[PDB]
Ligand binder design. Structure first.
Ligand SMILES: CCCCCCCCCCCCO[C@@H]1O[C@H](CO)[C@@H](O[C@H]2O[C@H](CO)[C@@H](O)[C@H](O)[C@H]2O)[C@H](O)[C@H]1O
Ligand SMILES: CCCCCCCCCCCCO[C@@H]1O[C@H](CO)[C@@H](O[C@H]2O[C@H](CO)[C@@H](O)[C@H](O)[C@H]2O)[C@H](O)[C@H]1O
Ligand SMILES: OC[C@H]1O[C@H](O[C@H]2[C@H](O)[C@@H](O)[C@@H](O)O[C@@H]2CO)[C@H](O)[C@@H](O)[C@@H]1O
Ligand SMILES: [K+]
Ligand SMILES: [Zn+2]
Lengths: 121, 221, 232, 232
């Protein structure tokens, strides 16, 4: 069973559709989970118990997992490495070792109702 | 904008095979606004005009709720007097309708009677706490009054949260315009006998049995 | 773009009255400038550039009216006989006061030109500055401004009279009702000067000083009339 | 039709500001030509045909502004108070320099008419060609051109200030940002001449030769200012 841990505020149903296409082409089940406080539940469960096969979280929490020895070193071929931006690969690098695959850049923004507020602050 | 220019509009419309105004004359709730427009002299003045419309063959004698609604919805009459609840059936018909202020009579406005639809629990019921639950937690809610309003409109709902949705409706604005020109009905126990006295008085004067002066005489007793 | 968020703009599609009305507006600001004589020499060139300050005031005033027109026909989208009538009364007034504004803008730019000390050119060119002419000056432009805002109030009330046909909601009724009071309050100041000049309490320049001084106290006097109606 | 393939044109529907603005534009090119006197005889007829070269330059210049206006209101589709304001400042400038352009176009066509050797008619008709008049000539049209491009830059920045309301994408943000720099760079050359004429380093015609020579070095000086901002 391929089990994935990702936050409930992300596209887990969409990640499951990718997982369903994976089981069609290979035969491996892909369940997606979104437990509360997974950033601090992952290092406790993965250290002792089985936990997930893959963990999705912003790159800031991964240095602590890398120091603790809770993440396998990533070894992706050149062809795959070249598909992503070289700046994204740096964020997922701890002590000269790639510790995760970069998905996307996130940044908070001011969301505003144009009807209640056309010219916002 | 005035009741006194309807006979002229009816003469103009009857030439094209159409009526000017058809509304329920049997129930006194619909005739009361015209009757209480000036005021007594105001009731005598108001009812004589209503009798003159029927005497001049502008309005039919036994105009009830069904033949007035059907006539407006079919497109046989230009106007009608009805409440919020009536709009859903017009929307269903292919009629481009508009809700507006009631016509003025003798300069002053027609004063309708403002009603408050209310749910009361029957004293001889064993399901009092089950009905309270239903009325409070299920009906009198944003979701509960929505389900009723989309079937047949409730009018200016009592729920504070609906204020913006009610203020977005052009027809609820006309309803509140008429409600301010009218007045709320006193809940008193004599309302039943009053409503009966006005119901009979209007029917007798409309059919042609009792005089307008003798109608207010029997109704004041 | 729009004034209110609760307002639903009926006149978003362009119409004949709107097009026709823009055309007149464009002509007023254009002919006010281009009615001037064509410079044939450097002396005429420098003379014509002194006219920009007067013309800037004229255009600023005309587009402000064009804006209030644009906003009205954007809100209601009206196209009826009575709207066509009132609208013509408006563009008719605009049109008759175009050139008299060029005159007043030039006249006032020379008086203020003398006060600030920028220029020192004569004012004998403008005629005889007598009590009757200076009185007729106020009464004229006062009557002119009052008509414009009186017409705007009449147009908002025509929309209000057709509130059910336009399907105006409670927010749109209140805007329309407020826009009438706004334009009547704007037409109260020129009307009050005009009335004071015509009666002539002093029989001398003092009358014209007061009538002119009501325009400098525009905002405060508009607040007094507005407060009086709310206090009761 | 359109400038960029990545740009999504918001102002594809025609509006009051656009209609009103076309009307003013059409009047400027029309009154520049038709403000001339009506030929009553063959002598007047041949005289009026000598005016085509000056008028061709005037119209060529006016439609270029009309184009930049058309493209702006096609891109963003704006209709707000601040856009209405800046737009009026624009059509106001256009309007005041219509006839002075007719003057400059005639004046420059007689100087170039004398150089190429096509005609040999006098230039005493135009006034006294003195240092102060020729200085005021530059300062005038320089101030005029600077204002036009300064306004265009102010309008692209107003759109940029409303980038989120218009829902501009990264390609549309870059176009808008580039259009500001483009119009500021266009307004830097008349501003630099104007500044050089007003200070007057030489106190003689040399000043006017330089100020005029910056227009012949328009493209190269626009590239110098552009390179300076990128080099740092
Ligand atoms: C504030 C500072 C600015 C003061 C500006 C005062 C302008 O004053 C105004 O000047 C212009 C100068 O062209 C005069 O206008 C004169 O020249 C224009 C030039 O084309 C002719 O079209 C017009 O026939 C003639 O009246 C006005 O008659 C005078 O009243
Ligand atoms: C390049 C080669 C072409 C040289 C063109 C030079 C044109 O020069 C210009 O000629 C026209 C001739 O009508 C003169 O213009 C004159 O005639 C026009 C004819 O309708 C009159 O409206 C105007 O009152 C008068 O100024 C200008 O005052 C002169 O400056
Ligand atoms: O006609 C007299 C009748 O009028 C009112 O009843 C209204 C009711 O309030 C409305 O909600 C609607 O149902 O129509 C009724 C008239 O048909 C009074 O409430 C009632 O006492 C009175 O009998
Ligand atoms: K003329
Ligand atoms: Zn014209």
């Amino acid at each position: 069973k391929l089990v994935i841990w990702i936050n409930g505020d992300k596209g887990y149903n969409g990640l499951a559709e990718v997982g369903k296409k994976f089981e069609k082409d290979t035969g491996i089940k892909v369940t997606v989970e979104h437990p509360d406080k997974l950033e601090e539940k992952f290092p406790q469960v993965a250290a002792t118990g089985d936990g997930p096969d893959i963990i999705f979280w912003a790159h800031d929490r991964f240095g602590g997992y890398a120091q603790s020895g809770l993440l396998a070193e990533i070894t992706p071929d050149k062809a795959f490495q070249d598909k992503l931006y070289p700046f994204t690969w740096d964020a997922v690098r701890y002590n000269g070792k790639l510790i995760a695959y970069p998905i996307a850049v996130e940044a908070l923004s001011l969301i505003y109702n144009k009807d209640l507020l056309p010219n916002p602050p | 904008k005035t009741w006194e220019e309807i006979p002229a509009l009816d003469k103009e419309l009857k030439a094209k095979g159409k009526s000017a105004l058809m509304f329920n004359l049997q129930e006194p709730y619909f005739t009361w606004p015209l009757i209480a427009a000036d005021g007594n002299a105001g009731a005598k003045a108001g009812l004589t005009f209503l009798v003159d419309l029927i005497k001049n063959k502008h309005m039919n004698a036994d105009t009830d709720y069904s033949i007035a609604e059907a006539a407006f919805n079919k497109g046989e009459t230009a106007m009608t007097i009805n409440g919020p609840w009536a709009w859903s059936n017009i929307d269903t018909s292919k009629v481009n309708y508009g809700v507006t202020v009631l016509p003025t009579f003798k300069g002053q406005p027609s004063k309708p009677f403002v009603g408050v639809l209310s749910a009361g629990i029957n004293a001889a019921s064993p399901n009092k706490e089950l009905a309270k639950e239903f009325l409070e937690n299920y009906l009198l809610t944003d979701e509960g009054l929505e389900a009723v309003n989309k079937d047949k409109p409730l009018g200016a709902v009592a729920l504070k949260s609906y204020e913006e949705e009610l203020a977005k409706d052009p027809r609820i604005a006309a309803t509140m315009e008429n409600a301010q020109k009218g007045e709320i009905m006193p809940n008193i126990p004599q309302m039943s006998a009053f409503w009966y006295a006005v119901r009979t008085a209007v029917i007798n004067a409309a059919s042609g049995r009792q005089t307008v002066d003798e109608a207010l005489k029997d109704a004041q007793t | 773009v729009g004034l209110n968020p609760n307002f639903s703009f009926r006149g978003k599609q362009q119409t004949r009255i709107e097009t026709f009305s823009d055309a007149v507006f464009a002509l007023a600001i254009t002919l006010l400038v281009l009615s001037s004589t064509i410079p044939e020499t450097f002396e005429d060139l420098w003379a014509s550039m002194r006219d920009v300050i007067p013309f800037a005031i004229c255009v600023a005033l005309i587009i402000v009216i064009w804006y209030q027109h644009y906003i009205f026909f954007l809100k209601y989208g009206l196209q009826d006989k009575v709207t066509i009538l009132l609208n013509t009364i408006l563009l008719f007034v605009l049109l008759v006061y175009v050139y008299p504004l060029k005159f007043l803008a030039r006249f006032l730019s020379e008086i203020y030109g003398g006060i600030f000390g920028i220029i020192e050119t004569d004012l004998s060119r403008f005629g005889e500055y007598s009590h009757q002419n200076l009185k007729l000056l106020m009464v004229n432009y006062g009557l002119g401004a009052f008509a414009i805002f009186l017409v705007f109030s009449l147009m908002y009330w025509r929309a209000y009279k057709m509130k059910s046909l336009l399907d105006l909601n409670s927010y749109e009724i209140f805007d329309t009702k407020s826009s009438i009071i706004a334009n009547l309050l704007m037409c109260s100041v020129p009307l009050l000067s005009l009335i004071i000049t015509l009666i002539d309490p002093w029989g001398n320049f003092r009358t014209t000083i007061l009538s002119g001084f009501l325009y400098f106290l525009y905002v405060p006097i508009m607040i007094v009339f507005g407060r009086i109606t709310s206090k009761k």
